[PDB]
Design a protein around this ligand. Structure first.
Ligand SMILES: *[C@@H]1O[C@H](CO)[C@@H](O[C@@H]2O[C@H](CO)[C@@H](O[C@@H]3O[C@H](CO)[C@@H](O)[C@H](O)[C@@H]3O)[C@H](O)[C@H]2NC(C)=O)[C@H](O)[C@H]1NC(C)=O
Ligand SMILES: *[C@@H]1O[C@H](CO)[C@@H](O[C@@H]2O[C@H](CO)[C@@H](O)[C@H](O)[C@H]2NC(C)=O)[C@H](O)[C@H]1NC(C)=O
Ligand SMILES: *[C@@H]1O[C@H](CO)[C@@H](O)[C@H](O)[C@H]1NC(C)=O
Ligand SMILES: *[C@@H]1O[C@H](CO)[C@@H](O)[C@H](O)[C@H]1NC(C)=O
Ligand SMILES: *[C@@H]1O[C@H](CO)[C@@H](O)[C@H](O)[C@H]1NC(C)=O
Ligand SMILES: *[C@@H]1O[C@H](CO)[C@@H](O)[C@H](O)[C@H]1NC(C)=O
Ligand SMILES: *[C@@H]1O[C@H](CO)[C@@H](O)[C@H](O)[C@H]1NC(C)=O
Ligand SMILES: *[C@H]1O[C@H](CO)[C@@H](O)[C@H](O)[C@@H]1O
Ligand SMILES: *[C@H]1O[C@H](CO)[C@@H](O)[C@H](O)[C@@H]1O
Ligand SMILES: [Cu+2]
Ligand SMILES: [Cu+2]
Ligand SMILES: [Cu+2]
Ligand SMILES: [Cu+2]
Lengths: 371, 371
């Protein structure tokens, strides 16, 4: 039988999450028969990756960052690489994604098309990786995603001392205070030290309250990728209890995405916000440019997995569930998101597609499960 | 001797507003003694206009609706007239000009350049008019702005029986219910009976609670202007007690501009929202395309007048006061508006300009007062 409420103990919460993930894996594989059991791809924990499997993905990411970009030069003069095209369209559509009826499905399609670019343009045969936050909640610097070795998405940045508190002011709600992390500067080690971030910043938070915004975040400004891994941020919004609480106590699609992103006026940035700002640095603290951090795709693999688990717990009522509109926090008011709403990814990959073709990981263009 | 508490009687609260406006006129004119007393412009109540002066203003707006548009066709394929240029830049910029730090200053510059277009291209030499809502709150159908005569902005629309209410979402709160007015269809008389809106709808609130939104509201979509005059909406938010209350009880620019536009979670839409939705119809109920209604300019002459009165009650503290950010209700977050923030009107008229040059009606490009 399945867990009913989330546990206040960290080990038990991991067991419930596992048992909920096993229930989700079971429901999906037993239904499937263009998608079969034989081409059903599997996404796995980045720790389940071998140190040779890690290098294949990293090498496939490094290759996409070296191919020429597809976006027209006038629409984004700062885009140079195939990697920049995905970042460019995320900057372009930040106002109509996030806190929208399309938030969860747009990012499921976003990461899927990012995988296709790896498989078709940089010859990737491995599995898509995801980052389990709760496993690294007590020591993010030891996390195999951020440990600074050459099997990581690079590690911490240079420790800038005497850094001010990060203050987050979205909307007109009172600020949320966060520690500045143990880094702050350019990344040290890892296979991405010479990775040149090209676009942004658009709305980058800074230690001390400021927000660096460029005149046009689509213009060319090459720079390094900065990081300041903040373990304290993870153990506040990303422990195993928080992850299982997000799944077991969200009973409608509204409560799920709201709790996931951070309920307004609640002092919580949710699992989505806490996963972004824990990396710190640039573009870690920029909601527009965050795909510029290579740990974005492992982060959203886990976001999709948490949505995938919650969906299967009641496929009758949760597969096609949608709530929200087409504008950030319905500001200003916009029509309700429906199954007929068409979204696109700009010039990154793919074409415009309706929402109903996105709700299932074993339908539409999708054919995959999680382990 | 100035009042400090707004009154409940419409008669004596009307007297209060005349005192404050007169004090404001006294402070501004004595301060002028490139802007002199000899060239100082005056903006007057639409009721102060004689018959010939009313037709003078209308015919210049009518001429603006026939001259060819300046906007390049690929940026706004639906723009056909100079009047469309102003509506198009408003649609384009709606999400960074409402509930921002620039809201009041952007619209002061917006109507000034619209006035400059009347003067330099349609030979207008008269005064800029405004609409005193408090005088028509007892019957909008009697208003000199809306009676549908030769000297109106056209009047009511064709009758549509048994219509549902208007549901307005203002923040993360339940919808505010407004009566649907006494019209609904295309306008029946007045000098704009045959006037064509060519843009939108971008987000048109409909009776019953629905909303229409074009896929791209900047494409060609010619149609009549619809109206549904609603006296009760003016009664709720635009009586003389409501106007004097906004001026006297607002202690800083944040309180003032929020109370003017409508505070979320209070059931009010402010005098600004009350003036827009009391017209009803299309584009009166569209936040983006609202300049498409010809009463928009007289409506925002009075919005500017109320800010001017509020400014002059404590010039040393209120002349250059700013609060807010560059995004609609700070969603998504953005840097604070400063005196150095720059705005433009696209291809409507003029060039870019900073906030410091916009805070006074007697500095920058401005030299005007209100009667
Ligand atoms: C609505 O507002 C946006 C601004 O947010 C306007 O977009 C701007 O349009 C101009 C010309 O169409 C773009 O100019 C471009 O400059 C680059 C510089 O490298 C050049 O390479 C291009 O060939 C082009 O000349 C400008 O970048 C663009 N801005 C943004 C942020 O996209 C838009 O025109 C406005 N629409 C209307 C109808 O006013
Ligand atoms: C950002 O998004 C806008 C629309 O959301 C894109 O603008 C479209 O561009 C195409 C190609 O030039 C035009 O055919 C459309 O008419 C445009 N639509 C609008 C509403 O302007 C823009 O190209 C996107 N930019 C990037 C870099 O993805
Ligand atoms: C998943 O299915 C297998 C076999 O069908 C079963 O043994 C296992 O217990 C299931 N998972 C859970 C959590 O019960
Ligand atoms: C930016 O931050 C610095 C502190 O490093 C502060 O002194 C400055 O006032 C901030 N800029 C603005 C415009 O507030
Ligand atoms: C404005 O100045 C005139 C000048 O004589 C004066 O009569 C009037 O009382 C003044 N009004 C206010 C409100 O100060
Ligand atoms: C829009 O969707 C919400 C659900 O978030 C629903 O409550 C509301 O009634 C919908 N509005 C209309 C006009 O259908
Ligand atoms: C905006 O200004 C306020 C002034 O009260 C300041 O406290 C805050 O840090 C500023 N925020 C940003 C993002 O600049
Ligand atoms: C298990 O560990 C988490 C951090 O991973 C704590 O937040 C919790 O209180 C429990 O001790
Ligand atoms: C203000 O409005 C009231 C109606 O609410 C009138 O009774 C009064 O004479 C003044 O016109
Ligand atoms: Cu995103
Ligand atoms: Cu994210
Ligand atoms: Cu406006
Ligand atoms: Cu307005």
């Amino acid at each position: 039988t399945l867990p009913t409420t989330a546990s206040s103990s960290t080990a038990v919460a991991s067991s419930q999450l596992d048992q909920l993930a096993n229930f989700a894996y079971n429901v999906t594989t037993d239904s499937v028969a263009g998608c079969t059991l034989q081409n059903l791809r599997v996404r796995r924990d980045w720790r389940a990756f071998s140190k040779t499997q890690k290098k294949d993905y990293i090498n496939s990411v490094l290759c996409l960052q070296k191919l020429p970009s597809r976006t027209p030069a006038h629409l984004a003069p700062g885009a140079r690489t195939r990697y920049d095209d995905f970042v460019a369209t995320h900057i372009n559509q930040t106002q109509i994604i996030h806190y929208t009826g399309t938030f969860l499905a747009w990012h499921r399609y976003f990461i899927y098309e990012f995988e296709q670019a790896l498989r078709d343009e940089c010859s990737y045969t491995g599995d898509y990786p995801y980052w389990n936050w709760g496993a690294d909640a007590d020591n993010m610097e030891k996390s195999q995603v951020f440990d600074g070795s050459e099997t990581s998405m690079s590690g911490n940045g240079e420790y800038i001392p005497n850094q001010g508190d990060i203050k987050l002011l979205l909307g007109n709600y009172p600020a949320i205070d966060l520690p500045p992390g143990s880094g702050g500067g350019c990344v040290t080690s890892g296979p991405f030290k010479d990775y040149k971030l090209n676009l942004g910043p658009a709305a980058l938070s800074l230690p001390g309250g400021n927000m660096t915004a460029a005149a046009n975040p689509l213009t060319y400004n090459p720079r390094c990728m900065k990081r300041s891994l903040t373990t304290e941020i993870l153990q506040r919004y990303n422990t195993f209890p928080k992850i299982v609480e997000l799944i077991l106590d969200s009973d409608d699609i509204w409560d799920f995405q709201m709790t996931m992103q951070g309920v307004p006026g609640s002092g919580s940035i949710g699992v989505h916000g806490g996963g972004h700002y824990s990396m710190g640095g640039d573009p870690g603290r920029d909601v527009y440019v965050s795909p510029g951090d290579t740990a974005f795709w492992l982060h959203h693999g886990m976001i999709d997995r948490v949505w995938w688990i919650w969906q299967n717990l009641d496929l009758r009522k949760r597969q096609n569930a949608i709530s929200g509109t087409g504008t950030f926090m319905n500001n200003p008011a916009s029509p309700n998101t429906t199954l007929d709403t068409v979204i696109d990814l700009g010039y990154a990959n793919g074409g415009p597609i309706a929402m109903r073709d996105l709700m299932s990981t074993t339908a539409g263009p999708f054919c995959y499960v999680y382990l």
